[PDB]
Amino acid sequence: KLIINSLYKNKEIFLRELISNASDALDKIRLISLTDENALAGNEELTVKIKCDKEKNLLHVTDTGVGMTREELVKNLGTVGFYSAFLVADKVIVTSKHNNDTQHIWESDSNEFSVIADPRGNTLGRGTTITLVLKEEASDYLELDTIKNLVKKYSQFINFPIYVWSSKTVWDWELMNDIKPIWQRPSKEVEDDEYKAFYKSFSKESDDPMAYIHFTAEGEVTFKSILFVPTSAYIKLYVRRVFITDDFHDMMPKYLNFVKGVVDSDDLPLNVSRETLQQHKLLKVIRKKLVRKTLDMIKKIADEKYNDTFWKEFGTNIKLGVIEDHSNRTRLAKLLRFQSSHHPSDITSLDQYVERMKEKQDKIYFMAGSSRKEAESSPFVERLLKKGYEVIYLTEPVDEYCIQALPEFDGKRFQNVAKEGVKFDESEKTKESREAIEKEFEPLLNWMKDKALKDKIEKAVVSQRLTESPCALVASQYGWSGNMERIMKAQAYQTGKDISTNYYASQKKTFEINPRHPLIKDMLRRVKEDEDDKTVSDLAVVLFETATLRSGYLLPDTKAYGDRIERMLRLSLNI
Amino acid sequence: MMKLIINSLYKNKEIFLRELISNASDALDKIRLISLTDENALAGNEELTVKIKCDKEKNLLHVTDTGVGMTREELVKNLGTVGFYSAFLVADKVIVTSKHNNDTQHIWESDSNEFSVIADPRGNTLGRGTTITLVLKEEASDYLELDTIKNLVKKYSQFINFPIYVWSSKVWDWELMNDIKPIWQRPSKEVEDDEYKAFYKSFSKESDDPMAYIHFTAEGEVTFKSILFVPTSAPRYIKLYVRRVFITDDFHDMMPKYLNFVKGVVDSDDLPLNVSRETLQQHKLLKVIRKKLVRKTLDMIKKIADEKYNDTFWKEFGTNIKLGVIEDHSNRTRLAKLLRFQSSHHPSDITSLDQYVERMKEKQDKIYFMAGSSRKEAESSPFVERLLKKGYEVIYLTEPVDEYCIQALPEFDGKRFQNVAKEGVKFDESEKTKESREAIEKEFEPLLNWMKDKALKDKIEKAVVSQRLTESPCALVASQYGWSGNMERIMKAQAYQTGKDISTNYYASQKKTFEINPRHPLIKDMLRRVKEDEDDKTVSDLAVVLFETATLRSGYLLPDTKAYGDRIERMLRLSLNI
Numbered sequence A: 001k002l003i004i005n006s007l008y009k010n011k012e013i014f015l016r017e018l019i020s021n022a023s024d025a026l027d028k029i030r031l032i033s034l035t036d037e038n039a040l041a042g043n044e045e046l047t048v049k050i051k052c053d054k055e056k057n058l059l060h061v062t063d064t065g066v067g068m069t070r071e072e073l074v075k076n077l078g079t080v081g082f083y084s085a086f087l088v089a090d091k092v093i094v095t096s097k098h099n100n101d102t103q104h105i106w107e108s109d110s111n112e113f114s115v116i117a118d119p120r121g122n123t124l125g126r127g128t129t130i131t132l133v134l135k136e137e138a139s140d141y142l143e144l145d146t147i148k149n150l151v152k153k154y155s156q157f158i159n160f161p162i163y164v165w166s167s168k169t170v171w172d173w174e175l176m177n178d179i180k181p182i183w184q185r186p187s188k189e190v191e192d193d194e195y196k197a198f199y200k201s202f203s204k205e206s207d208d209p210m211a212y213i214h215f216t217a218e219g220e221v222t223f224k225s226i227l228f229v230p231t232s233a234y235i236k237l238y239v240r241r242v243f244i245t246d247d248f249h250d251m252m253p254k255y256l257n258f259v260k261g262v263v264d265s266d267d268l269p270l271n272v273s274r275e276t277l278q279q280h281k282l283l284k285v286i287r288k289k290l291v292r293k294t295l296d297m298i299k300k301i302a303d304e305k306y307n308d309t310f311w312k313e314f315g316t317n318i319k320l321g322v323i324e325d326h327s328n329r330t331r332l333a334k335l336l337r338f339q340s341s342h343h344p345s346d347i348t349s350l351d352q353y354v355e356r357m358k359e360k361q362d363k364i365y366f367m368a369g370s371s372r373k374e375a376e377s378s379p380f381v382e383r384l385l386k387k388g389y390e391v392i393y394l395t396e397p398v399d400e401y402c403i404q405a406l407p408e409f410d411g412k413r414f415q416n417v418a419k420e421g422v423k424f425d426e427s428e429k430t431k432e433s434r435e436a437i438e439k440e441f442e443p444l445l446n447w448m449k450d451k452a453l454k455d456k457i458e459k460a461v462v463s464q465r466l467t468e469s470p471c472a473l474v475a476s477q478y479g480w481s482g483n484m485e486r487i488m489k490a491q492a493y494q495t496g497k498d499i500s501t502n503y504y505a506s507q508k509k510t511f512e513i514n515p516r517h518p519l520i521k522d523m524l525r526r527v528k529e530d531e532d533d534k535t536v537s538d539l540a541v542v543l544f545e546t547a548t549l550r551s552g553y554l555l556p557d558t559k560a561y562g563d564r565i566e567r568m569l570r571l572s573l574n575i
Numbered sequence B: 001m002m003k004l005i006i007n008s009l010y011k012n013k014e015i016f017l018r019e020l021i022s023n024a025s026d027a028l029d030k031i032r033l034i035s036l037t038d039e040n041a042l043a044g045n046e047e048l049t050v051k052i053k054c055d056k057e058k059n060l061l062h063v064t065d066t067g068v069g070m071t072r073e074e075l076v077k078n079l080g081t082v083g084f085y086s087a088f089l090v091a092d093k094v095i096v097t098s099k100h101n102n103d104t105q106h107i108w109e110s111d112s113n114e115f116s117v118i119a120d121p122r123g124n125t126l127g128r129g130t131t132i133t134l135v136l137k138e139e140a141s142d143y144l145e146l147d148t149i150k151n152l153v154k155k156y157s158q159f160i161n162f163p164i165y166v167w168s169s170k171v172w173d174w175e176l177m178n179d180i181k182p183i184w185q186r187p188s189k190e191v192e193d194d195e196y197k198a199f200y201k202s203f204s205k206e207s208d209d210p211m212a213y214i215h216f217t218a219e220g221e222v223t224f225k226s227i228l229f230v231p232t233s234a235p236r237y238i239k240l241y242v243r244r245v246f247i248t249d250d251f252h253d254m255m256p257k258y259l260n261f262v263k264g265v266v267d268s269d270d271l272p273l274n275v276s277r278e279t280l281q282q283h284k285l286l287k288v289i290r291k292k293l294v295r296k297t298l299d300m301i302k303k304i305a306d307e308k309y310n311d312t313f314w315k316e317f318g319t320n321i322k323l324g325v326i327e328d329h330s331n332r333t334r335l336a337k338l339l340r341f342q343s344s345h346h347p348s349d350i351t352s353l354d355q356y357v358e359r360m361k362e363k364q365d366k367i368y369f370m371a372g373s374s375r376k377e378a379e380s381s382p383f384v385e386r387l388l389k390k391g392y393e394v395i396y397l398t399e400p401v402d403e404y405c406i407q408a409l410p411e412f413d414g415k416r417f418q419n420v421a422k423e424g425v426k427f428d429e430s431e432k433t434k435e436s437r438e439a440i441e442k443e444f445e446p447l448l449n450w451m452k453d454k455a456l457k458d459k460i461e462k463a464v465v466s467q468r469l470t471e472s473p474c475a476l477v478a479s480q481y482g483w484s485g486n487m488e489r490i491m492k493a494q495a496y497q498t499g500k501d502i503s504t505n506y507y508a509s510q511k512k513t514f515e516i517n518p519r520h521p522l523i524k525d526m527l528r529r530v531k532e533d534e535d536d537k538t539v540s541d542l543a544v545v546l547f548e549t550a551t552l553r554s555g556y557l558l559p560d561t562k563a564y565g566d567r568i569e570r571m572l573r574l575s576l577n578i
């Protein structure tokens, strides 16, 4: 009283599940036999045998796999999968024999079951026979002509012999299956169609993979493998073509946990324990080779699909990789993509930035923020942008960490535009021009440092990075910037709890002023005229607090800042 | 670790014995656990004991247990790579004789460096178990005394639930050293305070008293004895026994996640003994035991002295009590009574909800709160201005969980909660004041309509005369079921650090209620110049800046700091003479 006639949509999937289950039973007895010599005592062979029965209206799926004990026949046989057998039959008869127990039978009509002993005894040796009593409607599955194609379809990647009872012109078993694994075949003998059809066989339906790679590893260890990149955000391990496990969760590093595939080695031990084989020295050589072939796979993807598709899905993985993977860092560095001032939305690689650098530019400039808009509208990038330097914009929380794990790219050091180190060159006769303006505005500097912003600024200097903005707060090289304040301060608030007593944390920054900006020109002209004035003092403080938000730091006191604004607003209105 | 582990523990070198008894007990727990599903698991050696022999003559100290033992492969993994290396504090050479049920008897020898495992020439001596033999070093060769071990076992192996015997003298025969009866099985009244504390230290280290403990016995649906503890610090857990037999410490569902810091013992005589681990964890009686553990933990937490509760417990585990209010529906009332928050009543002191209620006005029915990233932000907010003046108390919520905590508690002792940053704040009003406000609202209508229809058109829901401001000119009030600045902040950070951009949200980018203060000089002046000339740009420009600043003051994010900086600039030029 559930499915039966709705999923149905996938009308003949019952066989796929019974063939799949039989293969799983076959894999399991084989796996045990590698440690237990007397495991294959009941049956020499490892097969799946399907028998058509017209007269009695029956269909048998017989496997010589592990089998099931009475206790297992109760739990395992219940509620695609085993139950899908009821999409074509109204009664399932499961005859099973296991090594540790005698032979039993199981019969359910989708509602109630019964686990009797077999009055015939041990007729299987070891394994199971799934007898389906077909419905009058789905009785077409008794036909030998149709059932042959039905197994040829759902067992293209089953690596155990599948036989069906047929005849010629003499009844006998016929192989419908080729058990030569797909990963063991010559690279170009395998069509692209087959690679995609293999991907859907173990990832349980869905669409094609984004990319794949099939290779024979050479050198210290030799193995065959087909790895896959999925479309949206499990490595099977075989030894000498014998399935071992898919539960070795550390086959790939955490940052590549999305890769799917098979590994098949002739150089690893077969008759050893699963624990033993997990710590084996050669396996680690396989793991390091999987990473490199995976990065080779990722690099083989075409430029547009790489940016618009791969990167959108796994970009955070490459960033986590850069930090976590020391050996493959340089390779991971080239796979990174970030938005830059070059274009309003296109993402750029680090190489592309490099090729665009000016002849005498030694630094890769970056601005970090919570969004594209705040990063690009920052005062810090004003003159760099005007002079034609490109600035990388980092908008994600991991970006900062990512670049920090990268001490250089292609000989160039990264420079945060919110910190000191932004280089602006000049000639001899150009150096004096600045130095004159620098000493002209020096009274305004000392006044800000010893009165207007006495213990609120580390120092005041004449900026060379601003064009439109009057001023900005710049942090020390070993200090925390605006964005890093957030990243750390909103994690010290979320998880940390009280983190203020730190040297380069909440420390005074360098207050830079724009000499060409009217509010600095007036402030200078007016500071040499009174100094005791609270008006310009209120101007210096309001400008400093505005510059703070502008620079990306929090305000120490919103009430004090508010009180100052409203006092100016009084002036602007009264006269 | 290497050879600099001896100097770090030169103080505590007598502890080597504790470490050998602890392991023997661990070995005995393991073999006894196997025997619950395996009938013939004790066929090699029937008893479960700890035997210690003094052999002065050969310079050897023997510690013979009858536990699980070690196989060939287990000797080359477990031994080598506090602990077992503790034996080297008193012995230069250490040899272990051992016998496991699956293997034959082997001898492991080492000094610290290389190791070698040989098949014992004598053969299967112990049936099962291990003998740790110490070649006691000269400068510590005094433990081979017929009374020194006698005294150490008695003071150290307290709480070991297996019989420990030393090869004494009187005729040489084994003399019992300890009492096998567990501390949790003894009647509450009889157990000493020191004994409870020493018990806490035995299974969790940390060498300091626990913050609190509870020793109870459960009657009714299920019976079990238990001792539960509150540690002193938040670490940055519960041993189950069935009929005095250790089963596991791997059940991570004994306590709900919010009480994960609780450590202790549960000894049940009702649970199935001769069954598997899988079977026992899913067992229906456990859910009954769990509910009892939570109620008893809460009893203990409630029993802590008022001063100690706020000063020590609340600082360590207040977040857990907050998550509890959200997750534990059947205990909500008990937990809500345990909450502590900062409030206006005092600069730093925290307060319970009962204490707040008692301080409420005779006709106040709402518990008012202000949420924010810090106390400074919350107390200097515009929203508490009037309430504070008129003597209402405002709870201050500064941790991100606090809002979800209050938002999960619909009422406390009949009083609903109200966020001052939202619509819903009330003030009892004398007939004189009520009418005075009515005249203020009609007088200020021209300023309210100008703001809503042109000056701030499309920025605000409506412009109204406030009842909550005092010193502040204006503020942004969110709707009854909308997001406060604090919720906007928490959601934006969760949509950035974890989420994948919630720009086009549900109610994050929504207009707020702009409340203006009629008694504020700047607003008074703003009314005068608007009626005189509505199309004056200087007042329109001012309106924007006042609003934008009000947005920072109201705890909201400003939508364009660049444009706002530039408007503040224009204002500064006009304010001065640029």
Ligand SMILES: Nc1ncnc2c1ncn2[C@@H]1O[C@H](COP(=O)(O)OP(=O)(O)O)[C@@H](O)[C@H]1O
Pocket: A017, A021, A022, A024, A025, A063, A065, A066, A067, A068, A076, A077, A080, A081, A082, A083, A128
């Ligand atoms: N032919 C079989 N031989 C042995 N065991 C089987 C067989 N068919 C089913 N089982 C057991 O019962 C379970 C039922 O299969 P199914 O419903 O497909 O679940 P699964 O996805 O794990 O295979 C299997 O996991 C297996 O434990």
Ligand SMILES: Nc1ncnc2c1ncn2[C@@H]1O[C@H](COP(=O)(O)OP(=O)(O)O)[C@@H](O)[C@H]1O
Pocket: B019, B023, B024, B026, B027, B065, B067, B068, B069, B070, B078, B079, B082, B083, B084, B085, B129, B130
């Ligand atoms: N008496 C013993 N009987 C059996 N195994 C032991 C014994 N002593 C030590 N071992 C083995 O050595 C391991 C390490 O002991 P120790 O260093 O104290 O670590 P731990 O107490 O945390 O297990 C034990 O876990 C066990 O595998």
Ligand SMILES: [Mg+2]
Pocket: A017, A020, A021, A081, A082
């Ligand atoms: Mg299945």
Ligand SMILES: [Mg+2]
Pocket: A563, B471
């Ligand atoms: Mg004021």
Ligand SMILES: [Mg+2]
Pocket: A468, A469, B566, B569
């Ligand atoms: Mg400007």
